[PDB]
Symmetry: C2
Subunit: 186 residues, 2 copies
């Protein structure tokens, strides 16, 4: 099902807090690929060129740099199924069963808002991040099309303060051109 | 009289063409100062810092550079009264009686729109620019609060293509802090 007007506005960072709801980890079920490799190859260049073309105060160089810092990660693949998140970091792999920890509504310096969905790995000897936060422009149950994930081992509160790095994941099957297509429209 | 909702939207580059009307040169009557000197002194820095703070894809450096190219001019003062525009360019002065040449509605790369109000100096031995275009976020008769002015000697059509340089003028009496105040709010 395509987006209602309330969902479209919420995706653009405009929503009433009263509409925000809990979501289950299953919203992010599936196999996913980091888009960072496509920034590196130059394959996301059309996205940044359109962003630049549309705002004369911006430059390609600066927009790319912002997304470089945003996307950068060595976790190339993430798999989510049956309450478990699996992380593929170069040749290291880790997984853990995550417990839901609620959501947090944020207001950004821009005046736009977003909701993060918080999860915790409750192991001692897990190599997987203790704290994970999903942010995907959705404020109520809906299967994700792509997500940013904040990963940390210190606390949720501390992770909530991270604003510059947000490794970003699209469905594993997509090629670079389909990722670009979605970024330019969806 | 403060702005109606239609005027506020039009100032943000959103309007129906059916609402656009001719304006008389008297809308720009008064004495005016270039804001370029205030960019140079650093006194516009708070404006660019707010612009940067509000959009993480932008930088201060790039925003300032864009406005540097926009504001740059040696025409420090302009006076308008009785159908005549007077230009003070360092120690040179020129003036001419301008005839109204209509308006042109433009759509920018950003999808925002604006209206330019066209005037011509019809002399041979005038040192004043032959073609002048006012652009001030107003689409119908209203006394200007500040304006961009495109100045050229080649043709109106050619001047219509200028997008990067737009020397910008606020009422002559204002100090730097009042200019900043207006830029941050009005
Ligand atoms: Na509310
Ligand atoms: Na769970
Ligand atoms: Na119309
Ligand atoms: Na006139
Ligand atoms: Zn996104
Ligand atoms: Zn202006």
């Amino acid at each position: 099902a395509p987006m209602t007007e309330v969902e479209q506005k919420a995706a653009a960072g405009v929503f009433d807090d009263a509409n925000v709801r809990d979501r289950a980890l299953t919203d992010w079920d599936g196999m996913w690929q980091s888009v960072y490799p496509y920034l590196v190859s130059g394959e996301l260049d059309p996205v940044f060129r359109q962003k630049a073309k549309k705002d004369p105060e911006k430059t390609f160089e600066d927009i790319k740099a912002y997304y470089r810092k945003g996307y950068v990660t060595n976790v190339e693949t993430i798999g989510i199924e049956n309450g478990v998140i699996e992380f593929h970091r170069d040749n290291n792999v880790a997984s853990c069963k995550y417990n839901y920890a609620g959501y947090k509504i944020l207001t950004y310096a821009s005046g736009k808002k977003g909701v993060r969905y918080l999860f915790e790995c409750k192991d001692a000897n897990s190599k997987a991040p203790k704290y994970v936060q999903f942010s995907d422009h959705i404020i109520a149950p809906r299967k994700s099309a792509h997500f940013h994930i904040f990963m940390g081992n210190t606390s949720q509160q501390a992770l909530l303060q991270e604003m510059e790095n947000w490794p970003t994941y699209y469905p594993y099957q997509l090629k670079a051109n389909e990722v670009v297509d979605e970024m330019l429209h969806h």
